[PDB]
Design a protein around this ligand. Structure first.
Ligand SMILES: C[C@@H]1O[C@@H](O)[C@H](O)[C@H](O)[C@H]1O
Ligand SMILES: C[C@@H]1O[C@@H](O)[C@H](O)[C@H](O)[C@H]1O
Lengths: 513, 513
């Protein structure tokens, strides 16, 4: 897999690396876990003591506690501990376990049976040869709960903690305007959304601070919108644009995600939709930041994503389907992706035209003709009048995703599109949405068709459910009908702070809901 | 338990802290373990590749190897490793296990049952967030074999080690005269002995570098003898004398062992014999180093150990017996210790007299009378003519230890004592010796009675057995009839480099065997 580096673009990205603010926080309580069928993933917390009382305890082999930090934090653990009893005559062996949910410190990691690496699960053994001890752990953890287990000391002495804190980090340490909304339930959702984005904003826009700690293009697109009306760090959107542009496949296609440690390496994973989203991110960045220099410099990268995407169309102007993981759309293994991909192409071509009008007017003429072909081809090949929905693939599957994306693409007439959104509400497709990522687009489609009250009710029903369940930050994965669901094969390795799920802040602020 | 600090003595000890020499060593092979009934603790090594070939390997989840370092080392692990395949998209989770014997990296630590802390078992989990990686582990390990297990990486990449070394440490980095002996089997034993002492000589004379990494008085006594004819670091014997003298029980009794991290703390463990051995260590130090200043300064400490010990005698001059752990002698739970303790008292009183002659002549007069009382009382109460052995305790137990110590004490006549050592041949006592520590004294008793050929044969039979089994260093525990034996409950937590077992070097060199 041949790649191409662009030193000029990478030097621009490097110069825009943000400083991180570091800030200490103590935890709020010691708790005990109780298995409970009717709770957040089967486990309930009960407060048992303050921390001042825990600092008086003298722990022996086998003793363990769970520390509730009170909110969701990303950062570095610091603690002090010391001996009690006789002079300490052996190392103290501890085991630490970190969780975003309570369930992550109650279910054993040894039972994880998924296709992501188990190494993402947060855990650390320590051997203290000398007491008293001052410990600053080097790895960055993302957690609310911390389990501390004394695996082994000798019978001659006991261990005693005197201080525990987390040093939390973020690049979103600037001001953040308060939301106007007079609706208390939307306010609560906005608060959770903003915290979600804050913890994801680091040296790049990370998708999730526990996992994958990495810049992805689909995620970036949504995060940039929220950033726009919260922390307004346009320099960081610019940095992330130059990163994707600075290291590409040799034919010019941008990667789905980028690493920045130990140096900038772009992944060998390529997605039809994420590539095209480079165009929409560049367009939204121009609108919000008003930086013509950057948009002009990066336009060729955007244009190239379109040149390459258009080669996937057959003679009749419909995107070819295949069984490999060629486009993302949602975490839904049974989803045929052809129709949704057609919609993404048409959506992003439209933005390529708006950009072309400024930087390459002559090309906009032919792009406009091409837009028309694709929309017509979508109607001819994909629309099914009897069902009132678009079908996808050789077996003519009906999904939510197909409808959402072809409505956003503005295929057909405004009243046809409004009729489709009513059809979802009264006659729901079989293949459902699994992520707040895809739900974001459902909301956008509702608003675009002037269904404003329906969009408000939908934000409240879906994201309000996560809030009512007790979420501090919004989740990577959420299907209300199956709250245990994981595409990875364990809810333990899902992310519970994922910024592609924090767009309600944008909807609420931008549309004045 | 009230203690007393002596700042003057501790400042002298601190000023004599030795510099450590650090020196790099590569391992010699990759091996595979095979369960084998007739081998060193049930496990046999087979070489499978060089290290140059292992540095070409690309390891995935579940792969593991065993690295043979070729000898016994004490020090710090350094290695480099890097990614292969796709760009690394998750942390690399490794598990390291360290063993002095092969069995320690083959038997699972999770099965350890014992009264010593399991935290002594050497083990370390690592999560590498970034590759390539340069790793220098901070803890000091004592090992020959190293197991390296890749617990988890993702399917997209593999791990590849490019260098592995141990940085070995010791304070015995000076010259060391070669042994004269023309006997090839004694030469082999001397080589193993010298390496044993070398690894135990650190910032103090440690009893064992894996465990307990600590200065004990009984161990010190034997280590100082060997030091005398090998590395000749008298400054270190002096340091260790001032440590025991510098922090005592409030009534003046020295502790059995001393900690030196984070500061000097003497243990709350007190042993009749180890306390008295302060006298013999001071005496041997004067003979070898010729340092009258130190011996004069520390004489009051020595004298006080005798004052206190003599209070354990009844009116008739026999030491009172009890079932608590009041005296050490050997790791033998079934041993009645009264007779051996009587012998240790008489042995150490004799040295207190030789010291008193120089620093307090008037006291030697009464000590000489007391020596006579104790020897007489030993004959009257403990000698059994019908059996030709000394008995110990109310149940008149016959042990090896009783005979050994009362012969070293020079109770009775030279011929009586020679007849006792012959009797150990013809009617071996029921309660056997479990350590090379006690065996050292058996050898000394043989030599003292002029049984020189028998002492040579006994060094060869016992220590030669450990060599023939494949030992790089001599062991803390060794009963030939039960090689699996542990007073701690698992052979995993025994020490396999214990300097109280390296005295053959002294015997061989000092007596020109
Ligand atoms: C497809 C890509 O990878 C998944 O693991 C994460 O959910 C990420 O947010 C998504 O954009
Ligand atoms: C009794 C004392 O402690 C044991 O654990 C060690 O074997 C040490 O060497 C010994 O001197």
């Amino acid at each position: 897999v041949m790649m191409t580096r662009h030193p000029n673009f990478l030097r621009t990205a490097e110069a825009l690396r943000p400083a991180l603010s570091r800030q200490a926080h103590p935890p709020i309580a010691v708790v005990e876990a109780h298995a409970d069928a009717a709770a957040l993933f089967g486990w309930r917390a009960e407060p048992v003591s303050t921390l001042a009382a825990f600092y008086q305890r003298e722990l022996s082999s086998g003793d363990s506690v769970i520390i509730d930090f009170g909110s969701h934090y990303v950062g570095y653990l610091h603690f002090l501990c010391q001996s009690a009893g006789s002079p300490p005559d052996a190392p103290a062996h501890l085991q630490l376990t970190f969780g975003e949910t309570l369930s992550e410190v109650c279910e054993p990691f040894s039972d994880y049976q998924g296709w992501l690496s188990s190494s993402w699960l947060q855990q650390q053994d320590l051997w203290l040869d000398v007491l008293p001890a001052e410990i600053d752990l080097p790895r960055r953890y993302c957690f609310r709960y911390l389990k501390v287990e004394v695996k082994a000391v000798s019978r001659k002495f006991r261990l005693q903690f005197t201080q525990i804190e987390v040093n939390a980090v973020t690049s979103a340490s600037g001001a953040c305007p308060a939301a106007t909304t007079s609706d208390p339930q939307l306010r609560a959702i906005d608060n959770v959304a903003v915290l979600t984005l804050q913890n994801c904003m680091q040296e790049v826009f990370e998708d999730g601070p526990k996992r994958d700690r990495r810049l992805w293009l689909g995620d970036l697109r949504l995060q940039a919108l929220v950033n726009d009306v919260t922390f307004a760090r346009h320099d960081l959107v610019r940095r992330c644009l130059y990163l994707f542009a600075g290291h590409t496949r040799e034919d010019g296609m941008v990667s789905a995600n980028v690493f920045v440690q130990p140096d900038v390496i772009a992944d060998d994973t390529f997605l039809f939709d994420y590539s095209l989203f480079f165009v929409d991110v560049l367009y939204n960045y121009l609108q919000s930041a008003e930086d013509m220099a950057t948009a002009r410099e990066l336009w060729p990268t955007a244009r190239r994503q379109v040149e390459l995407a258009l080669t996937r169309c057959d003679a009749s102007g419909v995107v070819r389907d295949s069984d490999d993981w060629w486009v993302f759309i949602d975490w839904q293994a049974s989803l045929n992706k052809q129709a949704a991909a057609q919609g993404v192409l048409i959506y992003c071509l439209q933005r390529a035209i708006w950009l072309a009008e400024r930087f390459e007017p002559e090309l906009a003429v032919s792009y406009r003709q091409r837009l028309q072909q694709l929309k017509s081809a979508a109607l001819d090949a994909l629309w099914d009048p009897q069902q009132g929905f678009y079908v996808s693939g050789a077996r003519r599957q009906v999904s939510w995703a197909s409808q959402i994306w072809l409505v956003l693409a503005e295929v057909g007439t405004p009243q046809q599109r409004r009729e489709i959104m009513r059809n979802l509400e009264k006659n729901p497709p079989a293949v459902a949405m699994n992520t707040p990522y895809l739900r974001h687009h459902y909301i956008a489609a509702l608003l675009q068709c002037g269904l404003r009250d329906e969009a408000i009710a939908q934000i409240k029903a879906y994201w309000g459910a996560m809030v009512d369940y007790g979420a501090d930050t919004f989740w990577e994965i959420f299907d209300p009908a199956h709250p245990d669901f994981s595409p990875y094969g364990s809810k333990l390795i899902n992310s519970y702070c994922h910024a592609w799920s924090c767009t309600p802040a944008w909807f609420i602020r931008q549309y004045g809901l």
